[PDB]
Amino acid sequence: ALTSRTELDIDPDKLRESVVELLERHPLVFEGTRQLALQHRPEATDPWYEGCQRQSLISSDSDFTEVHGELRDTYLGEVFDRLPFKPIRTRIMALDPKYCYSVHRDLTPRYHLAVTTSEHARFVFIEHDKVLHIPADGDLYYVDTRQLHSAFNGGDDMRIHIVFGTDG
Amino acid sequence: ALTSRTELDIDPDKLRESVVELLERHPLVFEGTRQLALQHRPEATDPWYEGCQRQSLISSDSDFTEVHGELRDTYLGEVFDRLPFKPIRTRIMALDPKYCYSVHRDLTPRYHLAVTTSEHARFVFIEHDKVLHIPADGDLYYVDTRQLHSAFNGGDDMRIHIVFGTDG
Ligand SMILES: [Fe+3]
Ligand SMILES: [Fe+3]
Structure with missing residues (x-):
């Protein structure tokens, strides 16, 4: 499917407060899609970026x-x-x-945990013709971004997700 | 419905070159959506804006x-x-x-004639869960922007439309 939910039963407010504090110590880099690395290679000299x-x-x-x-x-x-x-x-x-992406396909799908979002932040699947919102509900959403798609944030605040890859 | 096409028979390349010419003497204003007025109030002192x-x-x-x-x-x-x-x-x-704007409802629906666009420009209707592309094909597209919608331009170029209002 385009999307599946795994209940993690995380508290969205505590997760938000936690992420907000982390970003004060380790700011996001880039613009458009701003990023912070939460996993690093063993013995990395620049683990956060x-x-x-x-x-x-x-x-x-x-x-x-x-x-x-x-x-x-x-x-x-x-x-x-x-x-x-x-x-x-x-x-x-x-x-x-x-801000928004090109309509494109990703090589690999990822899992999204929405930390801060709003009704203005959506994924858009062009062939499936579906519009999809990831709520900040403390649960994990598989999103199949191999499907032709974009994502946009029409709001005035950043839409912050945590985005996990997997091999298996 | 959310959309309708009226075949107007406009030549897309003359339209485009005619627009590019106009804008060289009368620039767009503003940043997210950049604009130029093509109609004015009678006796307006700032008719282009x-x-x-x-x-x-x-x-x-x-x-x-x-x-x-x-x-x-x-x-x-x-x-x-x-x-x-x-x-x-x-x-x-x-x-x-x-760039993309908020998910919102316009006071008034309008007719779009696309001048320059790409596959990365789309309208998104949240409640109808439709995604719509307006091509630079010389034809007039009515779009019921009273419906809860956003639009986005994920491309590298500006997406130029002519947007017409009407009374009937
Ligand atoms: Fe623990
Ligand atoms: Fe649909």
């Missing part, structure tokens, strides 16, 4: 395996504890206000 | 009845001459690249 990527040439996700040590004492670490899979290359992916 | 003001400043489109004089001998004037309705508050409306 190396996994962040947005160039047209995608690198492999497989070696970004280590949840950063300082998440362990945070509610955000509890999200990683509850995951039904081992994540790889987990990032905070924040869509800027008034 | 008064019709572009935000809604809280405009009682209704009806006053904006006058196609500028300098258009009347261009291809654009010929577009005006082919409408099946009398138009009001006609504007050039251009979405910036990678």
Whole structure:
């Protein structure tokens, strides 16, 4: 399906407060889609940003395996504890206000946890002709972004997600 | 329905070149949606831009009845001459690249004639769960923007439309 829900039973307000505090210490980089790497390669010199990527040439996700040590004492670490899979290359992916993607296909689908969002932030699947909203309800949403699609944020606040990859 | 096509027989390339020419003497204003008024109120002192003001400043489109004089001998004037309705508050409306607006309802539905566009420009109707593309094919597309909708331009270029109002 385009989308599936896995209940993690995370508290959305506590997850938000946790993510807000993290970003004060480790700000998002880039513009348009702003990013923070939550997993790093073993013994990485730049653990918080190396996994962040947005160039047209995608690198492999497989070696970004280590949840950063300082998440362990945070509610955000509890999200990683509850995951039904081992994540790889987990990032905070924040869509800027008034910003959207090209209609395109991704190589790999990902799991989205909406941290902050609004009714103005949607995925748009062009062939399926469906519009999809990921609520900040503390649950995990598989989204099949191999389907031709865009995502947009029509609001005035950033739409902050946590976006997990997986191999298996 | 949300949309309808009236075949107007406009030549897309003359339209485009006629618009690009106009804009070199009368630039778009504003940032997210960039605009130029093609009709003005009688005796307006700022005819090219008064019709572009935000809604809280405009009682209704009806006053904006006058196609500028300098258009009347261009291809654009010929577009005006082919409408099946009398138009009001006609504007050039251009979405910036990678830009989208909020999910909202317009006071008034309008007719779109696309000048330059790409597959990354779409209208999204949230309640009808439809995604719609308006092609630069020379034809007039009515779009019921009273329905809860957004639009987005995920491309690298501006998406230029001509947007016409009417009274009947
Ligand atoms: Fe825990
Ligand atoms: Fe549909």
